[PDB]
Design a protein around this ligand. Sequence first.
Ligand SMILES: O=C(O)c1[nH]c(-c2cccc(-c3nnn[nH]3)c2)cc(=O)c1O
Ligand SMILES: O=C(O)c1[nH]c(-c2cccc(-c3nnn[nH]3)c2)cc(=O)c1O
Ligand SMILES: [Mn+2]
Ligand SMILES: [Mn+2]
Length: 174
Amino acid sequence: AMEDFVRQCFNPMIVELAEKAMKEYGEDPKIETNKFAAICTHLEVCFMYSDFGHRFEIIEGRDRIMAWTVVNSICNTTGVEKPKFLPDLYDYKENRFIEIGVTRREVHIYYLEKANKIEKTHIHIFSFTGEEMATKADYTLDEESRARIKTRLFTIRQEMASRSLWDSFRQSER
Ligand SMILES: O=C(O)c1[nH]c(-c2cccc(-c3nnn[nH]3)c2)cc(=O)c1O
Ligand SMILES: O=C(O)c1[nH]c(-c2cccc(-c3nnn[nH]3)c2)cc(=O)c1O
Ligand SMILES: [Mn+2]
Ligand SMILES: [Mn+2]
């Protein structure tokens, strides 16, 4: 049901990407259906964000070799410190990496988790409630761009609840 929902309600390209991010590292998407669903959602957000500008480099959804190649190439030509972990985007207009959070919980809680896990990386957090949080409250995008994202997340939430899948999903976050 959760799997059916994922395959039915997300772009093939994204489902194909989500499944590799799992299947290389040994997780089965037929069993960790909620993680599957989550990874897809996070990918979709990253792509959506990436599209609404060529302002943004998409670093998520690549294999490790490509991502670090892309990160190194950005660091050689801009001078910006190289982060320890792969973030999700780079913003060529503000000249900072971005880490994208999607949370079923409250935004400040997921913000702190991420902020603690890392330093000059801009953090942006979306919830399924149309709530967002971002370092220095600098939300990077225009409101229209941030509304498409919020709608889309909320839509996913509402589709999940149609199929009685939201409650499971909500509770399987850290
Ligand atoms: O596409 C990725 O690179 C990716 N995204 C995620 C990811 C992103 C957002 C949420 C979650 C998640 N939700 N619930 N459990 N994990 C997982 C995890 C990975 O291990 C991963 O390799
Ligand atoms: O691999 C990543 O790039 C990645 N991984 C994660 C990730 C990895 C493991 C667990 C979780 C998680 N558990 N609950 N919520 N998120 C999230 C989140 C991201 O936003 C992200 O960009
Ligand atoms: Mn990432
Ligand atoms: Mn992220």
